[PDB]
């Protein structure tokens, strides 16, 4: 035995046991969320071991709440949160593909295949797989009509699926209508998105979109107006923190002979108000700071009937000022010598009304100089849902962005993942020999998804998938069209149906970034045969 090194707490598994422990560890994190995907799929609830719950159908967020014990599992969790960065949706699915790739890969080396051969059998099947995407996604460049379809397909297999068509547009419209920027000669929609809130209580369907931002804040002093509308309003996003003023540190104050301690006491406050007025004198319909206004400096912004908001969200006053044409001012001084302020700093909106939403109230900002402001204020039964409703939002808004930032889209619904299944094996198997058996499993591993889309329905679905096969295989082989292929799964009603004929549609990007990373993960684990795991640092527990 051994001696080897080093125990205790430091151990290592070898060859078979690892290649297995790795696969088990992957099917683990995988098989949990293998129910989620597909319209037929459901949501789950995770317990904060302190009672607190959290209902969610998202695969990414769901795996995070799992805790990811072990290297192989956490590796998938890491691959998950990658997908949101690429896309935003499909996290639930990407994990599956990967897991299935290992599952099968190992089931090959368990057949004494050897990993090197396999790791290439994917390396190739992957490239050719994208070469087939070149035939599918391209036809999906031309087909606002098909944008509401993509935003809708991002609703199914989700809570907001029941109100899909309704929120399908609330999603599209804010980004399409009011959310466009431009940096260094590039046009793109907010990959950081547009403020979305949640309204406790109220109706499901009645989630109010807004023709402006929805800064979540309350009026500084009650004495201020609760609304200032009409047209051409004076907005001011001032991060000056115009509250008070204390001596500059390191600049101590020792007085004498006076009898002048008072001659500057007020002078400390004066310089504050002097700057406050200098700004109020340029517009001051609404003032929005980040640091906050002071009681002794609110009375001044109050008497003038100027709405003032104490300490706002810095990430907001930016997006707000960018739409109203204003300029989020940092320091008062502008060149030297300057106080200063210029009416050229203020913004341009229509209404600044502080609305109400069930025991709560937030200030809205409707209309802007540049018409780019959108804020969707959800509203449902409990926080437990109103939050998850947002998850379907953050995960659907994305699917659109990625789409509108890449002309190419793809017929989802198990369609693509079905064509590849037939296409590579029937047509990839030119090399043959052993490498063939590898490519094969790489294609077979793809069926994993279409399968679970069906198994999600209690009813025997072994056949519904069998049909999706013969159909898709029909595009070429075997033994001027009209092309009889391109169909897909209609989970809602059993039997195949053309997906393009339906609202269903997933961005090509998503079908790539996920197909690609699912491989690297798989590979990286294939190369594994020994996991040395050394114990951490124990407590001193010194007998002396």
């Amino acid at each position: 035995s051994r001696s080897d090194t080093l125990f205790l707490g430091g151990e290592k598994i070898s060859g078979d046991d690892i290649r297995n422990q790795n696969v088990l560890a992957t099917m683990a994190v995988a098989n949990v969320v293998k129910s989620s995907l597909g319209p037929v799929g459901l949501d789950k609830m995770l317990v904060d071991d302190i009672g607190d719950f959290t209902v969610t159908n998202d695969g990414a967020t769901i795996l995070s709440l799992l805790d990811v014990q072990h290297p192989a599992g956490k590796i998938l969790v890491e691959l998950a949160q990658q997908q949101d960065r690429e896309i935003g949706d499909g996290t639930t699915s990407v994990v599956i593909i990967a897991s299935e790739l290992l599952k099968r890969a190992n089931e090959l080396v368990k057949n004494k295949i050897h990993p090197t051969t396999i790791i290439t059998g994917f390396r190739v099947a992957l490239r050719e797989a994208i070469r087939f995407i070149n035939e599918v996604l391209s036809t999906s460049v031309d087909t606002k009509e098909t944008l509401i379809n993509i935003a809708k397909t991002s609703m199914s297999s989700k809570i907001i699926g029941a109100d899909s068509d309704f929120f399908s547009n609330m999603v599209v419209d804010a980004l399409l209508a009011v959310k466009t920027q431009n940096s260094k000669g590039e046009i793109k929609y907010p990959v950081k998105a547009v403020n979305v809130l949640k309204a406790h209580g109220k109706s499901a369907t009645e989630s109010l979109l807004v023709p402006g931002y929805a800064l979540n804040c309350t009026v500084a002093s009650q004495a201020m107006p609760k609304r200032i509308a009409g047209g051409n309003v004076k907005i001011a996003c001032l991060d000056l923190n115009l509250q008070k003023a204390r001596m500059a540190m390191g600049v101590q104050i020792n007085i004498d002979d006076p009898e002048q301690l008072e001659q500057i006491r007020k002078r400390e406050a004066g310089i504050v108000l002097e700057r406050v007025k200098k700004i109020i004198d340029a517009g001051a319909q609404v003032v929005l700071t980040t640091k906050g206004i002071d009681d002794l400096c609110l009375k001044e912004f109050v008497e003038a009937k100027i709405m003032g908001v104490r300490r706002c969200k810095k990430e907001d006053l930016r997006r707000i000022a960018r739409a109203t044409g204003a300029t989020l001012v940092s320091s008062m001084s502008n060149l030297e010598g300057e106080e200063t302020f210029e009416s050229s700093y203020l913004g341009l909106c229509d209404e600044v009304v502080q609305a109400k939403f069930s025991d709560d109230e937030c200030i809205l900002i409707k209309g802007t100089s540049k018409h780019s402001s959108s804020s969707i204020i959800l509203r449902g039964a409990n926080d437990y849902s109103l939050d998850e409703m947002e998850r379907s939002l953050h995960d659907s808004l994305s699917v659109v962005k990625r789409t509108l930032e890449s002309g190419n889209v793809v017929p989802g619904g198990g369609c693509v993942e079905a064509a590849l299944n037939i296409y590579l094996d029937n047509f990839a198997t030119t090399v043959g020999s052993r490498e063939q058996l590898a490519i094969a499993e790489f294609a077979a591993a793809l069926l994993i998804i279409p399968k679970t889309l069906a198994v999600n329905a209690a009813k025997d679905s072994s056949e519904l998938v069998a049909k999706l096969r013969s159909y898709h295989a029909a595009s070429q082989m075997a033994k001027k069209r009209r092309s009889y292929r391109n169909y897909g799964l209609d989970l809602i009603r059993g039997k195949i149906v053309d997906e393009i004929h339906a609202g269903v549609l997933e961005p090509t990007i998503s079908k790539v970034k996920s197909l690609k990373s699912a491989l690297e993960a798989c590979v990286a684990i294939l190369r594994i045969d020994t996991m040395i795991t050394v114990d951490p640092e124990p407590p001193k527990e010194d007998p002396h």
Binding site: P39, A162, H200, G201, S358, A381, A457, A458
Partner: protein, 73 residues
């Protein structure tokens, strides 16, 4: 159970009178909707089936309408 006890205050703030009732309805709403889960095909067919419900019901809930003078309150 923690989601229900939440609808209580979830409702009280919005109108502030349907305290006792919303819970009594929310609950019984599932009891007489349960045997249609297993005997029913899925939990999602019931979802869509509920929209056509709340929609129609809110309508009927509007039929029985009265006008407030704004003394008589």
């Amino acid at each position: 159970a923690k989601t229900l006890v939440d609808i209580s205050r979830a409702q009280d703030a919005e109108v502030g009178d349907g305290t006792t009732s919303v819970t009594i309805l929310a609950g019984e709403l599932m009891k007489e909707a349960k045997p249609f889960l297993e005997e029913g095909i899925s939990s999602h067919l019931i979802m869509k089936g509920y929209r056509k419900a709340v929609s129609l019901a809110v309508e009927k809930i509007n039929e029985l309408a009265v006008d407030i003078t704004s003394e008589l309150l």
